[PDB]
Amino acid sequence: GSSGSSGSSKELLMKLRRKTGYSFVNCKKALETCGGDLKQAEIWLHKEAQKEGWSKAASGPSSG
């Protein structure tokens, strides 16, 4: 349990990588936009996809 330059989210990035499945660079964005929140991070990526259209499959358009 040690670290160097305090100010980075890797442990969460690696986890969110397998959770959602999106590339590392991607998850990183959702993690920064949300603030290290697997939940608020998993929903983001999915949402962005629905709008942008990264993958064919339907992400899941929700209201409010």
UniProtKB/Swiss-Prot annotation:
Disulfide bonds: none annotated. It is found in: Mitochondrion. It comes from the Eukaryota. The modification N6-succinyllysine is found at residue 39. Expressed in all tissues, with the highest levels of expression in skeletal muscle, liver and kidney. Associates with the EF-Tu.GDP complex and induces the exchange of GDP to GTP. It remains bound to the aminoacyl-tRNA.EF-Tu.GTP complex up to the GTP hydrolysis stage on the ribosome. Belongs to the EF-Ts family. It is linked to Combined oxidative phosphorylation deficiency 3: A mitochondrial disease resulting in severe metabolic acidosis with encephalomyopathy or with hypertrophic cardiomyopathy. Patients show a severe defect in mitochondrial translation leading to a failure to assemble adequate amounts of three of the oxidative phosphorylation complexes. This is Elongation factor Ts, mitochondrial. It comes from Homo sapiens (Human). The lineage of its organism: Eukaryota, Metazoa, Chordata, Craniata, Vertebrata. The gene is TSFM. The chain holds residues 45 to 95 of 325 of the full protein.
